[PDB]
């Protein structure tokens, strides 16, 4: 079949039959990301993903015909690994110094490229001559994912994911029997572990006060039990949906860093420090935009660019964050469920497990 050079329109299933390209696709791209060069980046990402497409793996360079998002400089990327199974180029990047320690410095939370920039300069190169350093002093969100480096590096499954579902719900609560939180974000496509437990807050009866201040009360709760390792509740800023290098503007969510006492986990297996220090994101949004906060959050990265991606260039609207806009005529288009959003943007829906890209 004649498949589509938008993701939105790719079922991009946890099946992958080209691991081998997309992985040293993903090391090119990761490094063109952090090589400071947004461009290539982007040939790159949205070729290793159509291939994470395919249902078949690619053996001969003659597969590669009609497939899009394939330019001649990737091609000869491929080519360096049907006619002898590594690709030279990212195999060389692995082993490039700059790259090894942008991608070990930015493996800290709280780590920028700015911050991992400036430190490459300065000559360290291993974090362990970097926290030792006795001159350079570290922010605080620093200090944290540093503190807890060992713990947050060491991945989540869902069994942790779920420990922390209830955690949240236990919490939320008690501030609103009436809330809603779906665990969204990686979990919610079907990855089996992830770097954090992405969750999407919300409820029908709640004033446009008592929103702005549960991620707070719920905050200083785990506070008031030890749970809580490091908190920044940025102020729900969002409210025309913007297009263009916009984080500026966003639902009230906060970045954290929870306790989980192992006790409280239900995994089929059988260690010091019986809990463990775990990444949680948190957002809240008005029940008249959980249908987008949702979609927004859900992902993948790149399915979320390539979606309003989409519905721009395609449909002639606007996808936000958190709600959709018809510029030809020039009205709010809404909807109660991911479902009618596509419906919307004229999309065969694509389940969440299928937004794997
Ligand atoms: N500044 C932003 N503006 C809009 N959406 C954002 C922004 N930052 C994050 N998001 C949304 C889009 C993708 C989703 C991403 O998160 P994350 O990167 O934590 O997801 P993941 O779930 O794919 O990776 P992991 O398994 O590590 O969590 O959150
Ligand atoms: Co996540
Ligand atoms: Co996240
Ligand atoms: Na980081």
New binding site residues.
Partial sequence: KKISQYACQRRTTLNNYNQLFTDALDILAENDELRENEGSCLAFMRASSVLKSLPFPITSMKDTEGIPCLGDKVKSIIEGIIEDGESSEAKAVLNDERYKSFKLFTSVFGVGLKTAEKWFRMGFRTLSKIQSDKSLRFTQMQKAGFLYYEDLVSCVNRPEAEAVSMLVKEAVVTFLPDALVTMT???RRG?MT???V?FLITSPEATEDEEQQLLHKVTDFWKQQGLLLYCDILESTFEQPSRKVD?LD?FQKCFLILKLDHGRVHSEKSEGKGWKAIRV?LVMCPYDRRAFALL??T???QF?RDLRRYATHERKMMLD?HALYDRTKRVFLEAESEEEIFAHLGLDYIEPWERNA
């Fill in positions: 974000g990686g979990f990855k992830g770097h954090d992405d984080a966003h994101d927004g959050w992902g993948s990265r979320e964050n």
